[PDB]
Amino acid sequence: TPLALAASSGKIGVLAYILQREIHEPECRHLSRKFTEWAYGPVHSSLYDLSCIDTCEKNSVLEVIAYSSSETPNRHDMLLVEPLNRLLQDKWDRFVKRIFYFNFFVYCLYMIIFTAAAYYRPVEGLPPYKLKNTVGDYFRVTGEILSVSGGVYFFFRGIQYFLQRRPSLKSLFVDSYSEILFFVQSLFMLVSVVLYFSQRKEYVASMVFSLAMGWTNMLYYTRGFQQMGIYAVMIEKMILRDLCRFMFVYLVFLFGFSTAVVTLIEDGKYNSLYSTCLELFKFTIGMGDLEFTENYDFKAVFIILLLAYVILTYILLLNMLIALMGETVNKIAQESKNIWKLQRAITILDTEKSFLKCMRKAFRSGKLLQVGFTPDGKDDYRWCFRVDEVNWTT
Amino acid sequence: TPLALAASSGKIGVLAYILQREIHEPECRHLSRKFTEWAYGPVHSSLYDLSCIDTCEKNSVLEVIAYSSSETPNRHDMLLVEPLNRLLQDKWDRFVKRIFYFNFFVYCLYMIIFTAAAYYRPVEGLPPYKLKNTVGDYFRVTGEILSVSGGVYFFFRGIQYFLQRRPSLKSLFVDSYSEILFFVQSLFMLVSVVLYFSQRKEYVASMVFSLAMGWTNMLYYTRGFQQMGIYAVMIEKMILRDLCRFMFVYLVFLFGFSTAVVTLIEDGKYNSLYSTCLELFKFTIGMGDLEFTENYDFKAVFIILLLAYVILTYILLLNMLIALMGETVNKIAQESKNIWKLQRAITILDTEKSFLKCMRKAFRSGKLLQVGFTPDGKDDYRWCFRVDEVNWTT
Amino acid sequence: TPLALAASSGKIGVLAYILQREIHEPECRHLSRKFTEWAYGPVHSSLYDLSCIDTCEKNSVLEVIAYSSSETPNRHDMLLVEPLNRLLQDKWDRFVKRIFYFNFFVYCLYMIIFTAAAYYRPVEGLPPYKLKNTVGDYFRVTGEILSVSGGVYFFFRGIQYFLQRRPSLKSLFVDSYSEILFFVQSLFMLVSVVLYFSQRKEYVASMVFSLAMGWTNMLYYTRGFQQMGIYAVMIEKMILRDLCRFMFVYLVFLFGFSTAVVTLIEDGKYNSLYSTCLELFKFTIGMGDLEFTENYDFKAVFIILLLAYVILTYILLLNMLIALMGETVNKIAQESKNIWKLQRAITILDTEKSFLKCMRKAFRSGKLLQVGFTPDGKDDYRWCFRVDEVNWTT
Amino acid sequence: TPLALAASSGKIGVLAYILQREIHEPECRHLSRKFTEWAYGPVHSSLYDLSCIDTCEKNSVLEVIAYSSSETPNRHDMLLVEPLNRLLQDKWDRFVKRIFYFNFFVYCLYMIIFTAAAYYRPVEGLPPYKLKNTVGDYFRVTGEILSVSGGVYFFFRGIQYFLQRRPSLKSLFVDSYSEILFFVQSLFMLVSVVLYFSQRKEYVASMVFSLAMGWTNMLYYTRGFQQMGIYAVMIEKMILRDLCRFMFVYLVFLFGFSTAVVTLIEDGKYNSLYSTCLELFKFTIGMGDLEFTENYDFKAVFIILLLAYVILTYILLLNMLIALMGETVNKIAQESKNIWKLQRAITILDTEKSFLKCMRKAFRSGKLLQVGFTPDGKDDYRWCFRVDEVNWTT
Amino acid sequence: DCAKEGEVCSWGKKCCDLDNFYCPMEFIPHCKKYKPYVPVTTNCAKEGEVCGWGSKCCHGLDCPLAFIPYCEKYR
Amino acid sequence: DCAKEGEVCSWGKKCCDLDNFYCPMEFIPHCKKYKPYVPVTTNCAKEGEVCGWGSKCCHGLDCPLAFIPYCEKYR
């Protein structure tokens, strides 16, 4: 449709035309989209039309603008068109807000069960544990069974995300960042459920990464609120843009000097390439000890490298990284009020598809025959959703 | 009144109209507010009117603009209206400035008594101390009795603040920040006065927090000066806006990885959740030791987490916090000359209400019948407060 | 020529005139440079002329704009003239891009041989090593012979750079920065090849600097790509502008206080000037220990200096350096899309001169007699290189 | 005079009028200041007049604009008037530049003698030293006698500065910053010369501060050059504006918590107020150890304070200071090319007063009778100093 | 004036003699007895086996530091 | 393969057994013998006298840390 194709391409003015047309003319009023019922300055209560705006049968104008994969660079048509800046607010404050905090409550409840089922794990033995009849022993096997059942849920809901909308080809991370971190959390736990019944003691290494990642995924739910939503967005851009492109610049200094230090001196703390890359990571992080106590052959050369390392990656590179992160923090905080609304629309559209049965709540603001006739017929039907505006003409 | 309602809503142009009206017309000159006595270019000495501007009987135009709880976003009507940019300067340089430095002198005198009455506390003996006749022993029981008497004073003056103007519902901290820190200081000391006579040795734990907070409350008095007042304002916004909203983002990383580290390795320094949250706070603060000396089961996993902790909360999050604090420092230093004047007006209005008896100093610049007649009568009376301006018409 | 002299002086509008002239007039069409073959709005396919633009016989318009030594401050005529913004893109995507990644592949292959031929060096003995018939012993003498052969190649290609274009007089570093770091890498290895056959054990000290520098020179190849090219540019400006001018400001504090500390206390850790300059470098870097444990004569003076050192070079100077580096990071990231294209043109012009025999690939887009006649003759010949534009006239 | 009073008040347009007047009219040409000899576009060689611009008899227009004590806020009349932007350049490149580098050479020579006469001080004995006939023993008593003679010179030249131009009342530091640091250097050495012959071993404590300050005063001479002059200016503003106003905000936190920590726990490392203020300075500087190993009564309270100290003065206050220093670094680097020229004019005017006898070099560019007559007479005389300009009228 | 083993240290009073009572750190601490110094018991990882992932390395062998670390005897 | 006492350490070869030869640090070091462990000789500052400015505090007394520090016996 021409309406969805304007939304799937980032065209505000074409889309703001179609949603706010008022063609008042005989045999042309039925063509219109906005019907102004009355005006009483500055109030102008106008009944709109929701034909492909919210109607989830075909590609609706909201499912298109939300699922658009980070291209179509005229995004945030929400606050730029607005028969639907208030449709989202109507769906939120009436239907979606109560089911969102319930999901956040269950996920907090899931992580408290899972952080407590891991805090009281049995230490001795490597085999899958069998628990005798204890009040605390039975209450934690229920705690472990609930925890894996959550990891099954985020696994299948994560595959359901990939099959339904197929994101691919370097759009998996830019859009759809926060949906794959729930998927990685799930498969650390399924690996943990494999290694548990495989009688491997290393199951807790996979479970611990599933538990640290499970709590840091709790700031998925910050994304969507006005104030605290900016922190989850800029933690994403700093990993994906800043820290990911920088970690090939840094890693050629780390691997460059650590292969230099290993062949220079062959003693403890720098015998291997792995232990040398850790001691040189500690110098650029600041948390290293430049104690030149112990005697090496090529000790005086070693001080010249390690000072030309520290002055070069702790002074130049680390502060260069902080300066680039600081630009993407202050860029994304200026554009904060824009950046907020798209994440709620992705949540409001998702929660409406989760039920798929409550069609009485799926419609917004009733049917109304405001055309009065048609170009050929005398009857009509439309879904109105009026909205009262406050704009000023002097 | 319409004059106070313009002040209680942040309307400069409505309020700058009423304070600078000059309706020179028969049966309309009495309606005016500003009377220009003479003009001699560019000097224009004009006698104003103080009917509800300083008259503390009803809600005066100053008590309304000062006590407005951080909304009405057209604040700093002081330098934007100015029959009262010089009324505040007149009240300061004549009456309030001398009584302000006296209050700052007594508070410095109070803290020297209190920091010395605590420095020489008796160490042995859980029970409340009894002091024999000593020149230093009698002089410190006077020192402790004066110190509690100050903590009684800031307690009752703090409750007096809450009952007089009732701040509530997330306006206690935004406005009225610096008045509750004196109240928290007071109730750390009253808890200390309870635990002292309750024969508890833990009284000094409450007194020490009353003493550290008592000295940091001394930069209440910096607030109000032109140069050094900016430091007390941005230490407030960084705690309330920056550090408070950030400490839920950070705390899900801290509690996320510390529950991961505890279940991973069960040995010293990380056996408990509390000692693990301290060692992981030391890594993000920079002051931690990444010495991977001691042998753990899951040692190699532990290095991968703790490096993925340090790279994630000392590089990303800490510098993200510094970048957000740096924005609110440089935003609040551009708007510095504006931000200064409202804190003096809150101090100038408070010190005038403290005496409540020196009404001869409460009026400003004498009574004068500058109307000459009335719309019905032939006599008048007004409180003038003339001011000489320097604006230029070519 | 007037065309090259406009390029060798930074004159966009003079050079954009000559490359886009269309003098359509009898006895003047042959004078033109751009011939618009057809136009079909907004597409305008126009055949240009490459007479001195790419013709590498004389000083072509590209070899002049690329080799211009950092003066002529109207650089980035690439995207500002554009019959040659697409000539470079044509030479890249057809001929130069495949030979560039081959050079980057061989250099990665060279550094893997060289980092492995040094990782498995024999430790005992100082004389040149003769290896016995071993599968690993023969495979590393081939590895060392290939490694020196690379250091011979970057040596002669580096001298070839200096003789061909003679950069001099404080233009060696501003332009031609990245070509001398390959030359310094080469001569650390030739010194290493001298000291090896000179039976000196200190050959590995020169080889290690050749190996750390060899890996950090691998981000020469980042320079030229759109995204990751900015990191190699700002690591150059921070060394040359920021860190080089600052290191005379810092070094008068370092040498100032270290001569003060040595004469103050004469004991261990500060007996020499060298060991004192290292302990005072560790304080300004942050990685120093202000443990005032051990007893000195003039211990209390020593604390006053060392605190007046740390507050003065770790708080003032280091953060002053970071603030100046942060300005040149954010200045060079705004001008990023401009800064990228000149480094590819320096690479595209260099790789075309490396073959010097494939003249069939040296021409671009065929010969075409688009003049139809001459001012005197009836025949012509030109090298066209058409390009389709998308500019809009309403 | 009206010309000096325009300079002593910061009036560019009044002063640019008087220096560039060209009143070409009979009985008005003698009134003029600039005489255009010839014009050949765009070159306009115009002979000026130096009547009170350089004539050091009365208050010349240069000695007034240079010595103006940091008020008259329309400073940098140098590049804003310009018959004297080239008078300073003429005095520099001809007369003052050679005598400036000679002064910088002697001061470098003085500090090498003084840093070597202190490096080889005798250690044993407290009395004034007597040296036997040694080649190194005689060469260092000459080295110590030359060093004190420099400290006498900067002492009397420093008093000569204060008596000649009397700076006072909070203008000693804003202007005249770099002249009192040479005076403080001198009186650390005169105290050192008193304590040496007073047979006190503590003479070297005063000499060491004279030696650390003597090398940091060597970046007085950076001030005046175009590139490296900005570093000496912003090290002054960061001490005087930033670090001085901040050190009363910080010091109420330091003294606040250190009096809290001393009364809380009475054990080693925190027994005294002095040792506690050092350990709490090490925490806000970052270089402190939060090792909570040793057992205290009130240990758990001590962790709550010391974490509420570190989070409050290492996270808030230190980064707040760095953000304010970073503003005054980036503010003073934008205005760099302006800030440079006033420091050379202060040096060019000072070096001309140092000789006070070479009046042949004191005049600039010869006498010339370019008026031709007077309003009454037929003869004239003026000091011309022509300058060729390049401004463009189309 | 000491705080006995089991009583609350770090607020009112410190623990007693350090043969038995350490504090520890956990914000409402209780003076706890030390455990006995026990050596490397069973479920260890022997020499040449992977340490640092599944099991500790034993008493007479370091792990010491690698990505997949194998136990080794001292030199 | 050692570097003898007086020869250049820290470039070619390290110093010999650490009874005698430390390196030290000064960029062209020469393996130097240790000095003898000598106690606090004369020109010390006694107990109750000012240490840390003129003279060291003696062997049996700390300085320990103050602005004008006076020597003190241990507790």
Ligand SMILES: C=C(C)[C@]12C[C@@H](C)[C@@]34O[C@](Cc5ccccc5)(O[C@@H]1[C@@H]3C=C(COC(=O)Cc1ccc(O)c(OC)c1)C[C@]1(O)C(=O)C(C)=C[C@@H]41)O2
């Ligand atoms: C799937 C990816 C790309 C990812 C998975 C894990 C391993 C992750 O490390 C990274 C790589 C990494 C490792 C170390 C430091 C930085 C980045 O980034 C995330 C990933 C990233 C983070 C940090 O980002 C977040 O989790 C915050 C966050 C912000 C916005 C979100 O929408 C969000 O998902 C809801 C999570 C934390 C970890 O998930 C985590 O808990 C652990 C233990 C490692 C972090 O790999």
Ligand SMILES: C=C(C)[C@]12C[C@@H](C)[C@@]34O[C@](Cc5ccccc5)(O[C@@H]1[C@@H]3C=C(COC(=O)Cc1ccc(O)c(OC)c1)C[C@]1(O)C(=O)C(C)=C[C@@H]41)O2
């Ligand atoms: C009433 C609140 C909100 C408050 C009370 C105390 C405990 C406080 O910690 C906080 C929480 C906190 C704790 C640790 C770090 C940051 C913030 O912030 C202030 C509060 C805040 C600070 C820092 O802010 C200031 O006191 C400076 C200040 C600026 C402007 C003011 O008007 C002012 O009041 C006059 C004080 C210092 C403490 O009061 C302090 O001395 C101690 C020991 C803790 C600080 O809680």
Ligand SMILES: C=C(C)[C@]12C[C@@H](C)[C@@]34O[C@](Cc5ccccc5)(O[C@@H]1[C@@H]3C=C(COC(=O)Cc1ccc(O)c(OC)c1)C[C@]1(O)C(=O)C(C)=C[C@@H]41)O2
């Ligand atoms: C030829 C010069 C000017 C130079 C040579 C070497 C010694 C260098 O130190 C410097 C001086 C120096 C020393 C310590 C810290 C900073 C700078 O800067 C480079 C030079 C600079 C760096 C850092 O810069 C780079 O190599 C990155 C780089 C960016 C862009 C490039 O085009 C590039 O060349 C391809 C290299 C790394 C070293 O080459 C290196 O590997 C080592 C061991 C020292 C560095 O001297």
Ligand SMILES: C=C(C)[C@]12C[C@@H](C)[C@@]34O[C@](Cc5ccccc5)(O[C@@H]1[C@@H]3C=C(COC(=O)Cc1ccc(O)c(OC)c1)C[C@]1(O)C(=O)C(C)=C[C@@H]41)O2
């Ligand atoms: C006369 C003042 C105001 C001053 C004298 C000395 C003690 C000083 O400390 C200060 C106080 C101080 C102490 C510690 C940290 C910062 C500031 O600032 C300068 C003064 C300031 C500095 C730093 O500033 C400079 O010397 C750089 C400088 C920049 C521009 C200049 O014109 C200049 O004079 C030529 C010096 C270094 C010291 O002089 C120094 O060498 C020592 C040992 C202490 C520094 O006191």
Ligand SMILES: CCCCCC(=O)OC[C@@H](COP(=O)(O)OCCN)OC(=O)CCCCC
């Ligand atoms: C602000 C977040 C700090 C997190 C610290 C934390 O999780 O500790 C939780 C408890 C500690 O109680 P315990 O000492 O009994 O811990 C024993 C753990 N098995 O302590 C608390 O409940 C509150 C501690 C607050 C101190 C700042």
Ligand SMILES: CCCCCC(=O)OC[C@@H](COP(=O)(O)OCCN)OC(=O)CCCCC
């Ligand atoms: C991200 C870069 C980190 C560089 C670390 C590194 O070079 O180590 C390489 C190997 C180490 O294997 P080994 O333990 O066998 O090393 C022995 C060296 N002779 O380890 C690896 O192959 C992958 C290590 C990844 C851990 C984060």
Ligand SMILES: CCCCCC(=O)OC[C@@H](COP(=O)(O)OCCN)OC(=O)CCCCC
């Ligand atoms: C870049 C500034 C670093 C300052 C270091 C310094 O002053 O050392 C000076 C000499 C050291 O020679 P020595 O070891 O013989 O010093 C003995 C002092 N009595 O060393 C040198 O001459 C050059 C050292 C360069 C190493 C980076």
Ligand SMILES: CCCCCC(=O)OC[C@@H](COP(=O)(O)OCCN)OC(=O)CCCCC
């Ligand atoms: C700049 C603030 C530093 C605060 C340090 C401080 O409070 O110390 C106060 C005194 C110390 O005198 P004492 O050594 O006798 O302290 C004994 C305490 N009972 O020392 C002083 O009076 C001045 C010390 C100045 C040194 C920089």
Ligand SMILES: CCCCC(=O)OC[C@@H](COP(=O)(O)OCCN)OC(C)=O
């Ligand atoms: C860039 C600095 C390089 C300095 C350096 O490597 O010095 C090495 C040393 C080698 O000489 P040598 O044969 O060992 O003579 C001293 C014998 N111990 O040289 C000296 C003087 O002994």
